[model samples]
Target: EEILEKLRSIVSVGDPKKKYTRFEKIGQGASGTVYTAMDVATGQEVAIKQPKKELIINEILVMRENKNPNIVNYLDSYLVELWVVMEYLAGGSLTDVVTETCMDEGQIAAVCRECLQALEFLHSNQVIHRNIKSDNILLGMDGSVKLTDFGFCAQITPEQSKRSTMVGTPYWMAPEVVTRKAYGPKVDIWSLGIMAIEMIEGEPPYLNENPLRALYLIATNGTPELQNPEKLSAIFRDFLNRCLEMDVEKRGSAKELLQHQFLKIAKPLSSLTPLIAAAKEATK
Candidate 1:
């Protein structure tokens, strides 16, 4: 407490042990370790993410600035080693969905809708998620989807039009990012295209390829081809093409993507509950 008082700032910090009853670890990713916990007052299920002490402030600032259903909501946090409490989604991430189940067009279209909406909200607020892969997209028990992981997230200012940091997984990185050039939110669009392919084929085109090789291919290969284009509808294919446009200026914006014909067939959020249940059952 004294440490924060010395800084004399508005950053809020507290003790996690006193506020909630933590359960087994739920998951872990590039940014932090996540655990399922119960809010002692409300009894609501929540996830606690313990990020590195240095990165905690960045997460708090970004999270505090952005709040929407499509994005994970920030609930509470503690300073020492930084424990963050957030909304818990029992369904896990889309990464498990692709690897564990075969999704039809309706499912993928719904995913596209949910994610694009989230990205649209973030972009409007001058925040770039930077990481948009399936692994970071979480599904809740009620079928709500959210974008998580702000470790590489950046805030853009009106004075600066773009950010110049290569800070995401190799397979999902944009060409401009690989080349260390300034990039904007459209970089996420490229990753969305990669995710679209991942949903269809259960993996990106260069999944087995070396990381360096995959990055080179992403930079120079124009657009990645669908391993089995015949398996999906024409509208879906065209959507992928729009997202994969190598030129950042040519990439589709989330708002534009929301109107895509592919998303027209998107099933309601309720449709995803069963899939989530199946994944959980399989894991058990």
Candidate 2:
């Protein structure tokens, strides 16, 4: 009953239909379905997310508290079956970009720099974005990169700085997480490393393998080998090595990674506008 009251208090207790006009579905996942909609009063486009379960409070709470330019903005929420309205990012997700085109080092660095900023903010605030994958990274038509999907996020209290329960996508899962060991915010860095490889090679390591096999490999294998490592620049390879380091103690934090030499050459966020345009053209 207390939890119910908390949920009721966080979201406006009213009909969402009265405020927004729902349009076609934009995305679907195990957690929820996202639809493009318009604010009835403001006439601005927004993304309305409806959860599969009632416990979407975690995402709401996490998103509400953390506001960064690189993190998706949580506009408003309603309680009539729980509607989470967020800023609509028109350029689609990083998954689309990765699938449609192979990213060069400069583009990859630009994306990584933005993501690192978001991670640095979250980690400093004691929030752990357990899931960090290409699909969760959204791009705006104007070359903005933002992190979304807080369903698996964990809040670390000073008393409980380390988390033990396993969560997040298998392919991006860190070794410590798969082994059921206590882990910290660096886990997100590991996943970001996987995402960097995903951007470069168009797929994460162990894509063709069974899920269980992938988990086994992640748990037993020290570090998954990168595809065409020789072709990658030395600076970028070193950056990835710092991120994928199996030793949690040695793994670079989001703040440390932001200072990596590779990011020095990161093209401006505006540089990604052309890539987004090309991706949209390819889809059409």
Candidate 3:
């Protein structure tokens, strides 16, 4: 009821059609579909998300409270079908970049650095980004990187510091999460580790297995092995080991990972412009 009241206060009563012109669909998920649109007043490109129901209020609330550069900017929300307007990232997702072109170690570290900064901010605010896959990481043509897709975010208050909900993609699920243990923000760190491996090896550990089998493996198979561990730098391997620590207490926090030697080789986010440009060209 309190959440509904908050939604009532924040939701725009006017029709969203009057404000933005919808374009082609850019993405879709179980929750809803996202379309690229133009804001009528500013004539700026924006991504308008049309969620199926009011359950998306949690995502809106989290986005509303947290305004960080590392996270996607929420432009507005309307009562009409719960339309959510946000910044349209021209570079698409990290998934596109990873699929379209090979990235060097420095480039991968740069992406990790930006994501770590966002994770640090979210975790500090007691918000756990339950899903941290490459698909949720967006990039701009100018090399800006931001975290998106907050549908699975869990807000941890003093009253509820740990969550037991089984959510997130099968491939990115942490061991504690798949085992249904009450877990906290470290789960995001584990998912990020999986994503890092995905960026390195092109796919997660169990891409060929059934999702249920994958979950079972994640729960029982200790830490995942790298397909080519010998090819990776020692610092990079160490970073992954720190993130994939089976003991939640032993896993490095976002803040700690930011200081890892692997990040020392991270180039500026601007260095990603060429890769983003290449990806955009490839997709076109």
The TM-scores of all predictions, comma-separated, are 0.91, 0.93, 0.91
Candidates' C-alpha lDDT: 0.82, 0.88, 0.88
Candidate 3 lDDT trough over 10 residues, lowest sum: 50-59
Candidate 3 lDDT, 12-94, residue by residue in tens: 87888778886878766755678998877788999888722344777788898988999998988887645788898888899
Q: Flag regions of model 2 displaced more than 4 Å.
A: 1-5, 13-15, 29-32, 40-43, 51-55
lDDT of 2 by residue, 56-101 (tens): 7788888989989999889999866467889988989898788789
Candidate 2: clashing pairs of residues: none
Across 144-212, the per-residue lDDT of candidate 1 in tens digits comes to: 989998868878887997887778998888888888898898988888888988888878778899999
Model 3 clash tally? 0
Say which candidate scores most in lDDT: 2
TM-score between candidate 2 and the true structure: 0.93
lDDT score, candidate 2, position 154:
89
Highest TM-score scorer: 2
lDDT of 1 at 43: 90
Number of the candidate with higher TM-score, 1 or 2: 2
Rank all candidate structures by their lDDT, best first, as comma-separated numbers.
2, 3, 1
